[PDB]
Paper text:
The [name] ([name]) is an entry receptor for the prototypic alphavirus [name] Virus (SFV). The mature alphavirus virion is approximately 70 nanometers in diameter and has T = 4 icosahedral symmetry. Trimers of E1-E2 heterodimers are organized into 80 trimeric spikes on the virion surface. The LBD is comprised of eight cysteine-rich complement-type repeats, also known as LA domains (LA1 to LA8), which contribute to binding with SFV.
Inspired by the structure of the in vivo mimic structure of LA-3-5 in complex with SFV, [name] LBD-SFV was also prepared at a ratio of 30:1. This structure was resolved to 8.8 Å (bin4) using icosahedral symmetry, and the twofold axis region was optimized with the same algorithm. After reconstruction of the particles at the twofold axis region, to avoid bias introduced by icosahedral symmetry, two rounds of 3D classifications were used to release the symmetry, and the asymmetric twofold axis region reconstruction at 3.7 Å resolution was produced. Distinct from LA3-5-SFV, [name] LBD-SFV displayed an asymmetric binding pattern, indicating a bona fide in vivo mimicry attachment. In the structure of [name] LBD-SFV, LA2, LA3, and LA5 bind to site-1, site-2, and site-1’, respectively, with a maximal interaction area between [name] LBD and SFV, facilitating viral attachment to host cells. In addition, the properties of single LA binding modes, including LA2 only binding to site-1 (or site-1’), and binding of LA5 in site-2 (or site-2’) needs adjacent binding sites to stay empty, were also confirmed in this binding mode. In the fivefold axis region, LAs still exhibit a spatially hindered unsaturated distribution. Furthermore, the multiple cryo-electron microscopy structures of [name]-SFV complexes and mutagenesis studies have demonstrated that under physiological conditions, [name] primarily binds to E1-DIII of site-1, site-2, and site-1’ at the twofold symmetry axes of SFV virion through LA2, LA3, and LA5, respectively.
Author numbering:
A (entry chain B), D (entry chain K): 319 to 370
B (entry chain h), C (entry chain H): 1 to 438
The structure:
């Protein structure tokens, strides 16, 4: 897992390498109200339902 | 002129501060924390190394007797056996057939290489933080190393900087530490003088060169087998050696906040927590007089493209009108968006472009060039790349602006419902007023 | 056998412990705190010493002009003066009438005795105690060095002792400390790099041997008089030299609880406060067979004379009957009285004497000899001498016993009034019962 | 002043000297009640009155 904070891995004898996730989703923002909810449900899918 | 601000404790984050003197054109300073180090204060408790056992040659007193003599050595053991008739290659000496005596003697001591291979048991508290920071403004580069607490002032080309104490007091080191070579462990070690055999701390010394020693291995001597000379002894294996393979994990691969541990001296480098307050004192040479600064009028802002990715992914166009050609200081007065450059080269054509990074669907922020101001609002689509190998360069603010599409819809719906409710209240009030006036 | 107790942290106070194994005769062991030490943990901030001013000889160059060049020296000052017409012993050189020039140069540097004579500035925190205690019981008598924190166990004649963490966490040293020779001062010094002229810290260096130096003493050069070669300057006197005269007070003459201060290392000694827990683990050869110990029956205590002074000022006689002669481990189960010795040679005569010290006019305590018990009370008279040079040998408790004259008197008065009130209540209850029954 | 805790004075180059005071007074304990008040007045002459 690689959350929006990031993670580092150390393979074999190399130097450790870091990876950061990026704010991506599957809804369509700035479209219909039934799509903006999907866009904001792809992100943080635990407060969006409560707010709606 | 004095000033104060706060900057995040993130390595590589390009912090930009704005200075706005009443009698001069504004400045923009830039700071980057290129490295940190959080060193705790250490007290040595003891040093552990693999033991080694000394077995002096047996004393066979035959045609007589011998008696055990006690001494003062760590785990000293001495015993006497009776009735031995040892043999050697040439034959059997000690002509006396039965009444003989054999004396067995043993004790423990630190190894020969305890000076090069040992584990240190420390107790850590009251960490101190050290930083190295690049500061750049006007036309000066430079990186200085500063103690981050309210008591170190460094002068960088006539300006004085003081980095106040850190906001949070979190340190990844527990109250007790064990240090071995290049690894640090959060471990609870036995108290001095009470080590138990077979685990960490079977032998204990106050310092690598101290002569005293405390050892538990429970040596037990045994009666030598008939017709032989061997001094048989038994002893629990080496506690340090067992610890070496059963230590488990480390701190290097466990520390939170992603800062890496290093040894000699023990410290933890480059982890993000809290804010550094910074106080400044600038001389008058740095600023520029407003008569020299060009005057900017009728400044407005538009956005070409916006994609809220980690990199600098939004292009901004400012249009204006001026009288002379020069340089201005560009700033964005909100942390919802961060600008890439601090100074802009202003011409009479009336167009400049800037780059910004954000993380909100509908950013809204006020941007200033020299003395003017304007507001920018935009619509930003999410990016396509799932994973990027560089850290984020925005302040990570997600809540959209109130004029964006989403809150526009919310405002419209709430306005409709409120209109309906107020209309119902008015009708009821009119009817009740008629009823009372009847 | 495991045991625990608590012991006051007062030097010279002869604390006593009583241990009762159910199958063994009781034991009394004596502990005493001969010496203490309170090590604070220090990290050097900087060093200050009297500065020294170097002035290189003037460069009076004739028939032309000269230019000054900056240098990277602590508090450097260089200037050029025109129109100079110097003189020497034989005559006036620089043949040109007025096209001459002088270059004055000056800078400051740490004095050469700074390595021998200087003042250090520390930050102090997290004191650690250590002590040396003499223990004795039966035929054992020893003096040992122990750390007073819960992880140093020392073995004394087969017995394991652990002295726990101190009761309170009070320390005499403030957050910031200044050390000079053998005196310590609770002061606050300016931050490194921001000293001020004329006071403490006009020059600062990170360490005695460090190459860098920060000095700020307002060295100002002035043009030379007509017809002379002297390079005049004005420069504020030594801040360290001022401080050496106006430091004021100390800690050696101001520390509370009457504890000495010493330097190298910084420590505060014999500094009485709080309680020390003790955990003990004893072998089974320390006690004795109850069968082999004498039996005591019909134990009576009579006090001959009592006088609550600081010395052991009361005498007890214990009368009893015994079967066989031996040793008894006497103890007093209350802290109102403190006994002198811990053993008595019991003989068939059935008469033993003991000395004790108290601090109350009417003490009452239970004293035990071997396994027996007795309750013993006394009447004590004040002492005459107003002042003596030895510390208190009692526990400093003053509340008198319930059976004492004052409390017996108050008991009698309260009983009289209480019986009066009870009678009044009875009369009222009888009358109201009759009235209701009517 | 030399309260019951004691005090040290340091005079010239001599070693400091410490002095302690004893619990002395002028009443008569174990006597008449008006004398016991004197005895417990000499010690602690501030709570005796309140208690009485
Ligand atoms: C040379 O060989 C002879 C062979 O016997 C050795 O004589 C033995 O000497 C030992 C030591 O004095 C004797 O032990 C003694 O035994 C008696 C009891 O009989 C005991 O009371 C003494 O305290 C002591 O332990 C042993 O008896 C004696 N052998 C005989 C047969 O009597 C001799 O010691 C040898 N000499 C050398 C220099 O090796
Ligand atoms: C202030 O000083 C620092 C360091 O002297 C400057 O950073 C340096 O910038 C130059 C070019 O801008 C870097 O050179 C190039 O770096 C890339 C990095 O990938 C390398 O691949 C190239 O081959 C080339 O060497 C230089 O490395 C870099 N130094 C450091 C330590 O980062 C900085 O630019 C100065 N300030 C300004 C405003 O330029
Ligand atoms: C011997 O004494 C004579 C005095 O006449 C010295 O002559 C001086 O030479 C210097 C050469 O640099 C002249 O300085 C120049 O003067 C001009 C005119 O003001 C000025 O523009 C230049 O910038 C420079 O300062 C100086 O005037 C001249 N003295 C005069 C003409 O009276 C000669 O140098 C001496 N010889 C030595 C010292 O070996
Ligand atoms: C337990 O052992 C310690 C030492 O191991 C004993 O300390 C002893 O203390 C006495 C007096 O406190 C010392 O005697 C003194 O000798 C000097 C010599 O000039 C004299 O001026 C004094 O008036 C006094 O007589 C004695 O030397 C010392 N023993 C030593 C240092 O070995 C302690 O007394 C022992 N406990 C008991 C109950 O005996």
């Amino acid at each position: 897992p690689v959350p929006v904070d990031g993670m580092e891995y150390h393979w074999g004898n190399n130097d450790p390498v870091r990876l950061w996730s990026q704010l991506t989703t599957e809804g369509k923002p700035h479209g219909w109200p039934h799509q903006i909810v999907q866009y904001y449900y792809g992100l943080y899918p635990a407060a969006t339902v409560s707010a709606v | 002129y004095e000033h104060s601000t706060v900057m995040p404790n993130v390595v590589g984050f390009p912090y930009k501060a704005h200075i706005e003197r009443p009698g001069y054109s504004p400045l923009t300073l830039q700071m980057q924390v290129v490295e940190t180090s959080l060193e705790p204060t250490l007290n040595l408790e003891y040093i552990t190394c693999e033991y080694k056992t000394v077995v002096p040659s047996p004393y066979v007193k035959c045609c007589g007797a011998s008696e055990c003599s006690t001494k003062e050595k760590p785990d000293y053991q001495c015993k006497v056996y009776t009735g031995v008739y040892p043999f050697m290659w040439g034959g059997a000496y000690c002509f006396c057939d039965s009444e003989n005596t054999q004396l067995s003697e043993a004790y423990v001591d630190r190894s020969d290489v305890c000076r090069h291979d040992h584990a240190s048991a420390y107790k850590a508290h009251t960490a101190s933080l050290k930083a190295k920071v690049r500061v750049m403004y006007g036309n000066v580069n430079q990186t200085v190393d500063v103690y981050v607490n309210g008591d170190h002032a460094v002068t960088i080309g006539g300006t004085q900087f003081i980095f106040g104490p850190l906001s949070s007091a979190w340190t990844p080191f527990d109250n007790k530490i064990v240090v071995y070579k290049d690894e640090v462990f959060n471990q609870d070690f036995p108290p001095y003088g009470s080590g138990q055999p077979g685990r960490f701390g079977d032998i204990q010394s106050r310092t690598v060169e101290s002569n005293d020693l405390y050892a538990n291995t429970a040596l037990k001597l045994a009666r030598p087998s008939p017709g032989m000379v061997h001094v048989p002894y038994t002893q629990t294996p080496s506690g340090f050696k067992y610890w070496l393979k059963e230590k488990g994990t480390a701190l290097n691969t466990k520390a939170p906040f992603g800062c890496q541990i290093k040894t000699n001296p023990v410290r933890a480098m480059n982890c993000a927590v809290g804010n550094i307050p910074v106080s400044m004192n600038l001389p008058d040479s740095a600023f520029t007089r407003i008569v020299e600064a060009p005057t900017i009028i009728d400044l407005t802002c538009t956005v070409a493209t916006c994609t809220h990715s980690s990199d600098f992914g939004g292009v901004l166009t400012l249009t204006y009108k001026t009288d002379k050609n020069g340089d201005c200081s560009v700033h964005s007065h909100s942390n919802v968006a961060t600008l890439q450059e601090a100074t802009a080269k202003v011409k009479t054509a009336g167009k400049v472009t800037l780059h910004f990074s954000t993380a909100s669907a509908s950013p809204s922020f006020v941007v200033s060039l020299c003395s003017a101001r304007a507001t920018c609002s935009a619509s930003c689509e999410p990016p396509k790349d799932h994973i990027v190998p560089y850290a984020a360069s925005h302040s990570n603010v997600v809540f959209p602006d109130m004029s964006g599409t989403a809150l526009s819809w919310v405002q419209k719906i709430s306005g409709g419902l409120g209109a309906f409710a107020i209309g119902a209240i008015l009708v009821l009030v009119v009817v009740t007023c008629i009823g009372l006036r009847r």
